[PDB]
């Protein structure tokens, strides 16, 4: 392909230390024609706040993602008490075209923002 | 004062305004893993929904409030990403207390934020 | 209600409303350069209400200062950034109602703003 | 970790991309109160701007980025409610380290987040 190898990339945030929030727990389904969630992908943030290698540009066909990632658990190892059990982001994907898509969620213990910069690969 | 321990604000980050008339829908979690209908409402003229429920009927357990933030976006003739922001949380499992969310939108982010409010006594 | 300008400052940490944070709020003259304008600190409810009137309240440039740095400091928390500012123009375009709003964090904040209007 | 010694990063709620061509000036305080011009430059198409100073540069005390936001909305034919938006911290004073102010824009609204990391050794 181009220049990047996977089309769907999630970030997250520490809003509290300033810092990429390691090791969440990350879940991607995938809503099946019978309206069903079919377990797409997981994965965990890296030491960057980064997730790769979580799908191929075959592999991410159209259709409507949910991405959950687990903050609770996040929160708990530090010593902290979160608000939400978890962050979910629903959208539709590749309906446009086919192109690619980034996640960025920021986390603080009662309150967190999610961004989507989805960018045309090729123009 | 808070009569309901659950209200849901909500806002505009590309108008300035508060968003009005958006879809909100509370499911709570059953014995059985399942989500059945807690409350419905949309945001009246101030971006607030309240009065969705009652301290009586508020009781513990895994609640999941859910806006239909994508239906506000194409009335104004918006192509947004998410399908809808969706907030999840565990109330009052340390006791009865008020709860507020606050949604501050926009067609391809948004965050979301909890005021647990402490009962008079 | 009666207040122009009102400020909403949150606690993203505790989850709760940002109590005692001071307020200071700064109007540009027409000299160029910054007049205080109003002052104060965040109540309970982490609003500010009362800082001008209907009156006061002219049309310009308003420098808004949050000092978060003191804020975050008291409860032994480092935080990074000095402090919180928001400048804006106000009734250049109708004699409307002002809400800044604040969501904290140490290492992140985010500032929104309600316009709305003297309705009846 | 960053090779950058301060690195800023815009994004555009709005279309969900990255904001481009947005100006950057970075100023030092200076020991009498003064605020001196440290570094200036504009976005590139990635939505971030990079050389703004190296590390022999980026010495100790209080640095405020400006963004000029306002010119970033107009240029789209939006009026924005900001002026500009400024993120003033003070830097290298418990040591030297790379910064990453990130900043995501709304017409209305605007949160910007830090991160910073001890340089790679
Ligand atoms: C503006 C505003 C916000 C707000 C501000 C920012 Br910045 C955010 O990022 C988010 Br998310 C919510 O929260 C509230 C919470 C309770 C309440 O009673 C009123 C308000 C209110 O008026
Ligand atoms: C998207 C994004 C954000 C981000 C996301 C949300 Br949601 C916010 O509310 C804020 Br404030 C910032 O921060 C970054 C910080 C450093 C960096 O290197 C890259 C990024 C990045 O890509």
């Not at 879940?27 to 994965?43: I, L, Q, R, Y």
């Amino acid at each position: 392909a181009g220049e990047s190898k996977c089309p769907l990339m999630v970030k997250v945030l520490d809003a509290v230390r300033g810092s990429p929030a390691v090791d969440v727990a990350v879940k991607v389904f995938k809503k099946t024609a019978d309206g069903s969630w079919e377990p797409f992908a997981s994965g965990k943030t890296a030491e960057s706040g980064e997730l790769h290698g979580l799908t191929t540009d075959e592999k991410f066909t159209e259709g409507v993602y949910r991405v959950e990632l687990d903050t609770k658990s996040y929160w708990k190892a530090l010593g902290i008490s979160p608000f939400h059990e978890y962050a979910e982001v629903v959208f539709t994907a590749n309906d446009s075209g086919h192109r690619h898509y980034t996640i960025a969620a920021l986390l603080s213990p009662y309150s967190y923002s999610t961004t989507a910069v989805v960018s045309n690969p090729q123009n």
